[PDB]
């Protein structure tokens, strides 16, 4: 069959607050974001297409995914390698190299270590 | 010429406290470590043979050299890459990888970041 407005019997036949739209012989559901199926029964797996980059963990949530980034990465898809050289950390005209969740200073001659702190022209004795 | 004991005239003809040994027609100097030359005049350059490894700075000193190591290296010749994994820093059965003046933790599934602190099996909600 059958001629009836399924949207007017009582409870909403569409799950997860979808909008019920009557048709002749059936009905249709206008689903909210993140829900699928004839009656919006399914919570879509937003992680199914592997959106999280750089070995991030994908969290399948309500109408969205969340990425948990590997250290040193950021962004919605963990697509951004954080720039550790942004604060220009190298002393004495050292050159900063960005790495993963860290930086490297390329010190000029006569200077060492991590931040080029040690003056070796200073070894005056 | 000439017949004379150069070691008995007065001052020591050998520099840098070398031992004066008389010979017929001359004399010879028995130099202390780090000195060379007929009269021990020269302070040997202990850095001449490039003893300092891994881009270390060589200091030419009295009868010895000293190496100034690049960060993460140690030893007389800076030949030792310091083992940062010695203290077993990785939490939750993470695997430690030794690097230069740093370490990397290879976390098992469900754990992140530097020391594998973050439990993601814990994202219970
Ligand atoms: Ca109908
Ligand atoms: Ca979902
Ligand atoms: Ca970076
Ligand atoms: Ca003599
Ligand atoms: Ca010397
Ligand atoms: Ca190391």
Swiss-Prot record, chains A, B:
Gene name linked to the record: NOTCH1
Record: glycosylation sites: 26, 49, 57, 87
Intrachain S-S bonds: 7-20, 14-29, 31-40, 47-58, 52-67, 69-78, 85-96, 90-105, 107-116
Subcellular location, record wording: Cell membrane; Late endosome membrane
Site positions per UniProt: Interaction with DLL4: 60
Protein name per its UniProtKB record: Neurogenic locus notch homolog protein 1
Family named by the database record: Belongs to the NOTCH family.
Known role: Functions as a receptor for membrane-bound ligands Jagged-1 (JAG1), Jagged-2 (JAG2) and Delta-1 (DLL1) to regulate cell-fate determination. Upon ligand activation through the released notch intracellular domain (NICD) it forms a transcriptional activator complex with RBPJ/RBPSUH and activates genes of the enhancer of split locus. Affects the implementation of differentiation, proliferation and apoptotic programs. Involved in angiogenesis; negatively regulates endothelial cell proliferation and migration and angiogenic sprouting.
Domain notes for this protein: Interaction with PSEN1 causes partial unwinding of the transmembrane helix, facilitating access to the scissile peptide bond.
Segment of the intact protein contained: 411 to 526 of 2555
Positions annotated to bind Ca(2+) 2: 43-44, 46, 60-61
Domain EGF-like: 3-41, 43-79, 81-117
Organism of origin: Homo sapiens
Clinical condition linked: Aortic valve disease 1: A common defect in the aortic valve in which two rather than three leaflets are present. It is often associated with aortic valve calcification, stenosis and insufficiency. In extreme cases, the blood flow may be so restricted that the left ventricle fails to grow, resulting in hypoplastic left heart syndrome. Adams-Oliver syndrome 5: A form of Adams-Oliver syndrome, a disorder characterized by the congenital absence of skin (aplasia cutis congenita) in combination with transverse limb defects. Aplasia cutis congenita can be located anywhere on the body, but in the vast majority of the cases, it is present on the posterior parietal region where it is often associated with an underlying defect of the parietal bones. Limb abnormalities are typically limb truncation defects affecting the distal phalanges or entire digits (true ectrodactyly).
Residues the record lists as binding Ca(2+) 1: 23, 26
Residues holding Ca(2+) 3: 81-82, 84, 98-99
